[PDB]
Design an enzyme around this catalytic site. Structure first.
Site, PDB file in Angstrom:
ATOM      1  N   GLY A  98      30.046  27.034  -1.303  1.00  0.00           N
ATOM      2  CA  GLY A  98      29.378  26.445  -2.186  1.00  0.00           C
ATOM      3  C   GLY A  98      29.969  25.368  -3.134  1.00  0.00           C
ATOM      4  O   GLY A  98      29.497  24.192  -2.743  1.00  0.00           O
ATOM      5  N   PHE A  99      30.937  25.865  -3.792  1.00  0.00           N
ATOM      6  CA  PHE A  99      31.636  24.685  -4.769  1.00  0.00           C
ATOM      7  C   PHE A  99      32.905  25.093  -4.823  1.00  0.00           C
ATOM      8  O   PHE A  99      33.978  24.255  -5.300  1.00  0.00           O
ATOM      9  N   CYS A 104      39.075  27.657  -0.789  1.00  0.00           N
ATOM     10  CA  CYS A 104      40.102  28.951  -0.645  1.00  0.00           C
ATOM     11  C   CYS A 104      41.173  28.616   0.025  1.00  0.00           C
ATOM     12  O   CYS A 104      41.314  27.994   1.085  1.00  0.00           O
ATOM     13  CB  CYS A 104      39.186  29.918  -0.177  1.00  0.00           C
ATOM     14  SG  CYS A 104      40.112  31.576   0.085  1.00  0.00           S
ATOM     15  N   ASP A 132      23.096  40.519  -2.071  1.00  0.00           N
ATOM     16  CA  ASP A 132      23.316  39.300  -0.887  1.00  0.00           C
ATOM     17  C   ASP A 132      24.171  39.886   0.140  1.00  0.00           C
ATOM     18  O   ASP A 132      25.292  39.581   0.487  1.00  0.00           O
ATOM     19  CB  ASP A 132      23.946  38.252  -1.577  1.00  0.00           C
ATOM     20  CG  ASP A 132      23.962  37.008  -1.024  1.00  0.00           C
ATOM     21  OD1 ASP A 132      23.131  36.880   0.107  1.00  0.00           O
ATOM     22  OD2 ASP A 132      24.620  36.048  -1.028  1.00  0.00           O
ATOM     23  N   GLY A 134      28.335  37.009   6.831  1.00  0.00           N
ATOM     24  CA  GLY A 134      29.273  36.060   6.480  1.00  0.00           C
ATOM     25  C   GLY A 134      29.832  36.935   5.217  1.00  0.00           C
ATOM     26  O   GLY A 134      30.895  36.068   4.863  1.00  0.00           O
TER      27      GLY A 134
END
Length: 288
Positions: A27-28, A31, A140, A144
């Site tokens: 997303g933003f 890592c 969610d 993944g």
């Protein structure tokens, strides 16, 4: 822009974290494999830039995610080991998962063997049970989000859409985000609780065994119609026992979906071969 420090420090714990090799982005957030310069312990450093959290609305969403993840401690959930910030970044110290997620396994393998399905689902459901016992809904769950470590153990991560119910019969109506496999009751805004995670697990089990998602379509608008109408078909090639379980998990009526405790004891897990361990070879090839 702003280079991420080579040494990650915090005023609180006063530990020095050496930033290491890139692991991936989400997303933003970027890592990195971070190491404690004192103890030599290896962690996963999730780095979120403050330029992404300018709005007080966005600051809250992460503050909720962090609080939930912090309170969690389970061998099938990604371990939380502290969080901090400087004037540029917010650093979340997570448990390291070097074998990516079950999604990368799925793309490489397609339809996995049945014993593999049992293994992956068991460990995943065990993680989901702990969440539900602690009144936490993931909301969610996707391939993944089912991370894997060197031991091929499933560890549930990413609590960006996770919510904690406060009282007894609370049924949430607000879901601020777009999850992968979503239950019809969420699409209709009719209200939802724990059984949206069970629906997602149905999709996961389907995808593992069949090799493709139950409502996969190039069009996003078309996918939501399929879910609303409950339009899916489990091929005849699938084990009757397995297909039965998938159909109950993907039932249109949320109250007819199995509870977490009911899942472990289902015939599917007790009838056939269920290995306690998997080799890292399962990332690319079936077990021999």
């Amino acid at each position: 822009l702003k280079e991420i420090p080579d040494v990650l420090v915090d005023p609180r714990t006063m530990k020095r974290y050496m930033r290491g090799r890139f692991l991936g982005k989400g997303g933003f957030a970027k890592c990195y494999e971070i190491t404690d310069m004192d103890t030599k312990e290896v962690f996963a450093g999730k780095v979120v830039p403050k330029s992404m959290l300018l709005k007080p609305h966005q600051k809250e969403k992460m503050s909720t995610e962090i609080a939930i993840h912090k309170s969690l401690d389970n061998p099938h959930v990604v371990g939380f080991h502290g969080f901090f910030e400087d004037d540029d970044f917010v650093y979340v110290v997570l448990e390291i998962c070097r074998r990516r997620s079950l999604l990368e396994l799925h793309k490489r393998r397609k339809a996995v063997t049945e014993p593999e399905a049992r293994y992956f689902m068991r460990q995943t459901i065990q993680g989901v049970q702990y969440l539900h016992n602690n009144r936490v809904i993931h909301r969610d769950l996707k391939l993944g989000n089912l991370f894997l470590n060197d031991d091929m153990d499933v560890k549930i991560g990413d609590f960006g859409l996770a919510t904690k119910i406060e009282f007894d019969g609370e049924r949430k109506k607000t879901l601020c985000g777009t999850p992968n496999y979503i239950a019809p009751e969420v699409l209709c805004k009719k209200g939802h609780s724990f059984e949206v995670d069970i629906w997602s697990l149905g999709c996961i089990l389907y995808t593992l065994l069949v090799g493709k998602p139950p409502f996969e379509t190039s069009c996003l608008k078309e996918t939501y119609i399929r879910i609303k109408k409950n339009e899916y078909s489990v091929p005849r090639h699938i084990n009757p026992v397995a297909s039965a379980l998938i159909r109950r998990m993907l039932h249109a009526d949320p109250t007819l979906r199995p509870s977490v405790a009911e899942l472990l004891t289902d015939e599917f897990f007790t009838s056939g071969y269920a290995p306690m361990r998997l080799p890292t070879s399962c990332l690319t090839v079936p077990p021999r």
